[PDB]
């Protein structure tokens, strides 16, 4: 029963291993093994549930174990394993073949097979752990082993993509352990984790690997947000080491998602408004990407309210995600109408929902945006309006309070008006008629630049996928 179960899944694993083994042996091809590893995550996740855990036991017995003898026993100890007589030395799939990792030349140490075998061995370990959701000692045991192993290897061009997906599980398993239980050792463990990310990122700068630095920057920028150091994130993004060429669309959307949150506290919403929009277009619309589109759209609605301009309300009702957008619907209504008591009562009941995403602190500063937007609305109504009539519509305190708020927004060019005290009304200084000025000409220049940029980007990849058609013999 259990004998035929281990031979079926192991044969499917070796079949996928021999495909990427011959591709890296001849010259250097990094494109083909990368496309297979994309589907490997989905095929292995479903396969780990079937045929239990016994598919990975004979794989370690097959190939030679540099470090991997005692690591599988520690993984099988937590599950209280019953003895099936799985002791190594029973099943032998090598049988002295060149593609089978010939044993005599391997045992004599005349050839080194450990490079591709050991780096691939650590990949299947983190996949089974993420399926069973194992924590505590098993998480710390892997972090201690992997770090010296990556420092010993020279990390060639093909070797940089093997551990590129392993760093994601290092930071993921550390955050799930802290949120599950808080202790004194969780803080000291994060100190070493910060130094490990920076040492490997600096080494990857010489190799100039596109996917390696893409996964690290996404994990490092998120670490600064949890640890709460802004000065580290400000200088980190100033170097601009993130390549835009071969990185995946899923990795690009995560990059622009962090820049919108960093610039949110810098009081510059001009550049932050573009990063949150570009992150939506780069993120897929599929079901697995719904988790990112849910959090990204919650930030976009908050940025527009911080800009003093009411965004388009059609995004809430037309989308199918409005169930989670209900708290943000009443926030825009309170800022637009300018009701003072409605805004205070909205953030009070929904404070629990806004605590998880940490957007409640930004809602505290929306209290100012309620009045600043209302002043902009009433200013665009009538060019000449009395001073005391403003306090009657918004139910303000006195005329001395509104006098400062109108002259406050004109510093950034918001209201664009003047207050006449001797006359008794506030006259708007905006006559429009910009058709005679040069201001629209500056915007028209940047629009054509976007056209010539896409034309050059159209030339980036055109003939490239067709380059292999001429060299390969056709009919």
């Amino acid at each position: 029963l259990h004998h035929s179960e281990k031979k079926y899944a192991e044969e499917d694993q070796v079949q996928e291993l021999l495909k990427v083994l011959n591709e890296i042996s001849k010259t250097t091809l990094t494109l083909d093994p990368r496309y297979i590893w994309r589907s490997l995550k989905d095929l292995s996740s479903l396969r780990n549930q079937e045929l239990l855990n016994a598919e990975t036991l004979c794989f370690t017995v097959n190939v030679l174990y540099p470090d991997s003898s005692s690591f599988k026993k520690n993984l099988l100890k937590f599950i209280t394993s019953n003895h099936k007589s799985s002791v190594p030395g029973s099943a032998e799939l090598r049988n002295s073949y060149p593609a089978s990792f010939y044993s005599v030349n391997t045992e004599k140490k005349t050839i080194e097979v450990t490079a591709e075998i050991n780096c691939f061995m650590h990949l299947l370990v983190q996949l089974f752990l993420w399926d069973s959701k194992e924590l505590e000692q098993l998480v710390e045991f892997n972090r201690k082993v992997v770090i010296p192993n990556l420092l010993c290897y020279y990390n060639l061009r093909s070797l940089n993509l093997i551990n590129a997906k392993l760093w994601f599980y290092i930071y993921l398993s550390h955050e799930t352990l802290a949120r599950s239980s808080e202790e004194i050792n969780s803080d000291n463990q994060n100190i070493i984790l910060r130094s490990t990310m920076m040492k490997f990122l600096k080494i990857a700068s010489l190799k100039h690997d596109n996917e390696t630095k893409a996964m690290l920057i996404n994990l490092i920028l998120r670490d600064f947000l949890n640890n709460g150091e802004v000065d580290s994130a400000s200088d980190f993004i100033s170097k601009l080491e993130y390549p835009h060429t071969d990185v995946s669309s899923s990795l690009e959307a995560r990059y622009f998602f962090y820049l919108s949150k960093i610039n949110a506290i810098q009081l510059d919403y001009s550049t932050a408004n573009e990063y949150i929009i570009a992150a939506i277009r780069k993120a897929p619309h599929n079901s697995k990407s719904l988790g990112f589109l849910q959090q990204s759209n919650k930030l976009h609605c908050c940025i527009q309210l911080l800009m003093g301009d009411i965004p388009e309300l059609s995004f809430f009702h037309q989308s199918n995600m409005q169930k989670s957008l209900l708290p943000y619907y009443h926030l825009t209504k309170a800022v637009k109408l300018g009701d003072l008591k409605k805004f205070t009562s909205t953030i009070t009941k929904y404070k629990q929902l806004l605590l998880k995403d940490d957007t409640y602190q930004l809602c505290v500063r929306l209290r100012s945006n309620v009045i600043k937007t209302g002043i902009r609305i009433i200013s665009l109504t009538y060019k000449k309006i009395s001073l005391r009539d403003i306090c009657l519509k918004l139910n303000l305190d006195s005329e001395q309070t509104v006098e400062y708020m109108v002259s406050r927004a004109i510093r950034d060019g918001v209201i664009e008006a003047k207050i006449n005290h001797e006359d008794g009304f506030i006259e708007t200084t905006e006559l429009l008629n910009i058709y005679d000025s040069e201001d629209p000409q500056q915007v028209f220049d940047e629009r054509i630049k976007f056209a010539n940029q896409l034309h050059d980007e159209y030339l980036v990849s055109m003939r490239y996928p067709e380059d292999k058609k001429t060299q390969q013999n056709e009919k």
Partner: protein
Amino acid sequence: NYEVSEKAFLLTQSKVSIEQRKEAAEFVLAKIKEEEMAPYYKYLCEEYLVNNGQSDLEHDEKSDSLNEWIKFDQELYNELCKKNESKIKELNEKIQKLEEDDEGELEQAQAWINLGEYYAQIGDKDNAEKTLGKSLSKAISTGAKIDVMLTIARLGFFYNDQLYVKEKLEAVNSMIEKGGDWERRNRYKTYYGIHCLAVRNFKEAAKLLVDSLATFTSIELTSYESIATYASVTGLFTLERTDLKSKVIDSPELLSLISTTAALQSISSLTISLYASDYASYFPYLLETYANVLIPCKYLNRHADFFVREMRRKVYAQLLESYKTLSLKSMASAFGVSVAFLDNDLGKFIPNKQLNCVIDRVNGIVETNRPDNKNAQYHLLVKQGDGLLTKLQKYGAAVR
């Protein structure tokens, strides 16, 4: 079946003239008993859930209707199933003779045509659409193909189907060659005009409703006074003052409606007050029309008060171009408008750039801004140009 859907909607939510619910409830009870539809007597329970003026009294004592019992029972249900099983026995007896004969493609399709009418009159929706697809492929010409669309449009107007009905609507239109066919024109312009209602297109609504071939009046779906009802409502948006004195006021089809149906009054009180641009007479006719037109109609009351905001926007633009500087108290004693409530009425437009009115709060006078310029027109190209570049970058990066 126009009164079937009309009286059923009057029992949903009615805030004006609750006496109409009695004639509506007594009609739907006597209509279902005289027809073969089983489930439409049962649908009264689910369709009226969570609505003002509940027509059902079981656990909810807040029902304001005159007839408070729509409750479904097995006494009427069993009687309607007997008429359904007795009729299908006669049709299956004829269909069995047609299957053994199989004379031409018309008799083979007529078997499904009798079913397409049967499954539509027994209360089946998806089961009727499956029978209409068989008769569509067996039709010998376009004459039997459009009759399939008539049943599709019948079940689509009751359940508000904007997808399957709209797709089959343009399918009969395109086909191979359209031509000047009366059936593919008169019926299409009326039905497609009804689909433009719910989505509020207003571009084709004025052309396909205010302008009709003659009377329409199929009596099966919508009636004569209904087409003229939506014509007065939709004719106040796209049609400007040039067409109001031609296809509205001077239209010969609307001249005999005043002396025929006096319950509408949307082609006289609304048209004369707007053509004369008199706010004094135009104001009291808003609520009189809102009660007897927008509320009873199914495709109107869904929006309702939004139309009041849009219809009042038209008269504000008529007066704005008639003067530059005017006092606020001048229109108060003349057109009968409240000065204190005037700022709140105009406050829903001016900040949204819907109107150019500017009122001075010092001396209490209203001014006029520039109605049109080159700068305001280029702003539409900015939003249209930036919205277009999104698809170029989205579809450009998706294909690689």
